[PDB]
Amino acid sequence: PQVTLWQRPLVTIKIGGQLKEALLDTGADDTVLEEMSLPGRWKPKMIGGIGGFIKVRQYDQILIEICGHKAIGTVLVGPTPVNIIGRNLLTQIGCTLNF
Amino acid sequence: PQVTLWQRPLVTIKIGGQLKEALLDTGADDTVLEEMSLPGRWKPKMIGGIGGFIKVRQYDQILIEICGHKAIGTVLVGPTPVNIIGRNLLTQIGCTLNF
Numbered sequence: 001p002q003v004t005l006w007q008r009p010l011v012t013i014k015i016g017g018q019l020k021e022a023l024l025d026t027g028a029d030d031t032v033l034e035e036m037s038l039p040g041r042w043k044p045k046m047i048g049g050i051g052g053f054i055k056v057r058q059y060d061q062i063l064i065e066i067c068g069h070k071a072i073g074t075v076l077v078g079p080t081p082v083n084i085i086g087r088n089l090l091t092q093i094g095c096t097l098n099f
Numbered sequence: 100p101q102v103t104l105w106q107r108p109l110v111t112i113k114i115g116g117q118l119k120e121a122l123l124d125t126g127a128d129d130t131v132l133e134e135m136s137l138p139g140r141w142k143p144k145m146i147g148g149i150g151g152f153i154k155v156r157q158y159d160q161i162l163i164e165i166c167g168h169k170a171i172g173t174v175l176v177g178p179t180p181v182n183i184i185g186r187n188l189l190t191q192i193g194c195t196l197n198f
């Protein structure tokens with residue numbers, strides 16, 4: 001696909017046969033998902049965004065599917081208002097910015 | 100051009116006769132820049148990011164060159180760790196997300 005920016009670039013993700021809405025964010029280095037209980041150990045972490053930091057839990061090697069394109073990597077889970085797919089995952093699906 | 104995301108999508112912009120580096124951010128609805136004295140009449144505004152709200156000065160109808168492409172629109176000036184080019188200006192330059 002070719003996603004236009006007239007509207008926020010919100011797509012469907014599948015994180016364990018759960019369809020989830022998430023934003024493709026080129027501005028984000030990391031992937032941040034809404035509070036969820038994932039099996040596995042996590043590492044405490046504080047991530048900064050415009051505005052300040054938020055405390056998140058870090059999970060390694062999560063598999064997510066972005067428009068039926070698989071990506072596997074680190075995800076931070078915390079109280080975000082929106083799921084954010086960051087460049088750590090977008091690089092996996094071959095995502096580019098073209099102008 | 101075709102920007103890959105192995106690294107942050109940093110481009111050089113020209114604004115108010117100043118060359119600056121800014122991130123192309125499909126996650127941002129608006130363009131927020133580092134503190135600067137741009138010419139004109141501004142209005143205070145508050146905008147939220149993942150860590151909470153910040154106060155910005157809003158400047159309308161400002162000319163900005165992104166990789167030599169012309170864009171004229173709103174620019175928010177405020178306490179940001181990085182200059183960010185949002186979707187109000189990425190659409191003007193014809194940028195897309197592709198995979």
Ligand SMILES: CC(C)(C)OC(=O)N[C@@H](Cc1ccccc1)[C@H](O)CNC[C@@H](O)[C@H](Cc1ccccc1)NC(=O)OC(C)(C)C
Pocket residue numbers: 025026027028029030031032047048049050081082084086124126127128129130131146147148149180181183185
């Ligand atoms: C998500 C996270 C991993 C925490 O990365 C950033 O927030 N990265 C910042 C850049 C940054 C680096 C270092 C320090 C501070 C900021 C990008 O603007 C992220 N794209 C912005 C996008 O996530 C956010 C989506 C959003 C919107 C509203 C609420 C919550 C979240 N929009 C965003 O902040 O938009 C404005 C900049 C216009 C405020």
